[PDB]
Amino acid sequence: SVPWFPKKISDLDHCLDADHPGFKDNVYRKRRKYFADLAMNYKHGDPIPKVEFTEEEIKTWGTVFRELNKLYPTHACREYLKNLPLLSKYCGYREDNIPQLEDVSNFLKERTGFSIRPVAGYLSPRDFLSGLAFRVFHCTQYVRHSSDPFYTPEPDTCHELLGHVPLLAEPSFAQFSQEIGLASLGASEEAVQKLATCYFFTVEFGLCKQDGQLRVFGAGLLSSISELKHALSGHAKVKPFDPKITCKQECLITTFQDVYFVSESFEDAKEKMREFTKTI
Ligand SMILES: C[C@@H](Nc1nc(N)nc(-c2ccc(C[C@H](N)C(=O)O)cc2)n1)c1ccc2ccccc2c1
Ligand SMILES: [Fe+3]
Predict the structure, then answer these.
(1) Phi, psi (rounded to 5 degrees) for 6
(2) Which of 75, 138, 145, 159 does the annotation list as catalytic?
(3) Which of 7, 34, 57, 72 qualifies as a FRET site for 22, CA 20 to 30 Å off?
(4) Does 204 appear as a known binding residue?
(5) Nearest C-alpha to atom 25 of ligand 1 is from which residue?
C-alpha cells in the first residue's frame, strides 16, 4: 500500500536539546520555547505570528547579513542576486531588521505561489518534501546562537530568509522545488531518501556554472559565511550533478560538506530529476 500523504494544503496541519549552545542561556532557552509554541499552535490559513525580535537576535542577524552581503555579489548565482533587492524593498531586509515570515510568505505568494508555514524544529524529509508539493516551505522562526554566526548545524530563520527565500521567488527554481515534492508524495522510503539527497545537494548545497564561473545556489551555503567562502575557495571538491550518483552521497549534518555538485542550470537540474524520478 501507499503511506499517508497530504492531498490538500491544509493536510500539512496533520503531519531545546540540552546540548545546544544556547541551552545554558536562560533567555535563549525561554525564547526558543516561545518560538516552538507559536509554530505548534499554527494552523493553515492563520497569518504567521509576527515576532518582536530582541536586540541580541537582531545583532546576530545583522552580523550574518552584513558579512554575507559582502560575498553575494561574487559568490551567488544571478537569480539570487536578481531577487534579493526586491526582498529588501518589500520585506524589510536590513542590517537592523529581521524580516517577518508572514511578509516574506505574502511576497512569495504573489511571485511564485510559494508560501511559508512555521515549524518548531526538526521534521522528516518525507514531511518537508510533502510541503513543497503544495509550494509550502516549512520555516524556522528563531535565530542561531550568537556564539557562532558563521556556521550552525541547526537551520534557523537567518538560513530560511537569506538562504531560501530569494530563490523561492524565482519561477524556474520554484518549479524545480515543487517537482521534488510532487515526486515524493506517497513514494517508497528508498525513493524519499534518494529525492531528499538530490534536494540536499541542489537546493541546499548546490553550485551552478554561470557564464563559465562557479556560483552558489545552495541555501545552506548562502546562509553560512564560512561555508560560502569555503565552497568557492576553491579548496573544495566539486562534481557534476548527476541524480543516479548524487543520490548516493552522504549528507553531512554537523560539518561542511565533503563534496559539492554543479548543475548547469535550474532548467537542466529539473530535467535530470524528471528522468531520474521515472526510474524510482
Ligand atoms: C538533520 C538536519 N537535516 C538537514 N537537512 C537539510 N536539507 N538541511 C539542513 C540544514 C542544517 C543547517 C543549516 C544552516 C547552515 N549550515 C548555516 O550555518 O546557515 C542549513 C541546512 N539540515 C536537520 C534538519 C532540521 C532541523 C531542525 C531543527 C534542528 C535540527 C535540525 C537538523
Ligand atoms: Fe534549508
Answers:
(1) -65, 140
(2) 159
(3) 72
(4) yes
(5) 122
| 138 annotated ligand binder | no
CA gyration radius, the chain: 18
Resolution (A): 1.8
159 lines ligand 1 (CB under 6 A): yes
- 175 three-class SS: helix
How were these coordinates obtained?
X-ray
Choice among 57, 102, 160, 204 that is catalytic: 204
**For the chain, what's the residue count?**
280
Whether the link from the prior residue into 234 is cis, omega within 30° of 0, is: yes
The residues, ordered by sequence, that sit 6+ positions from 72 with a Cβ below 8 Å of its Cβ are 80, 81, 84, 222
Catalytic residue flag (residue 20): no
| Closest ligand 1 atom to Cα of 220 | 20
The domain defined by 1-280 folds into Phenylalanine Hydroxylase (1.10.800)
E strand or H helix that includes residue 34: helix 26-41
Distance between CA atoms of 19 and 22, rounded to whole angstroms?
Answer: 8
CB-based contacts of 65, cutoff 8 Å, min separation 6 = 93, 94, 95, 158, 162
Q: 118 with 39: CB under 8 angstroms?
A: yes
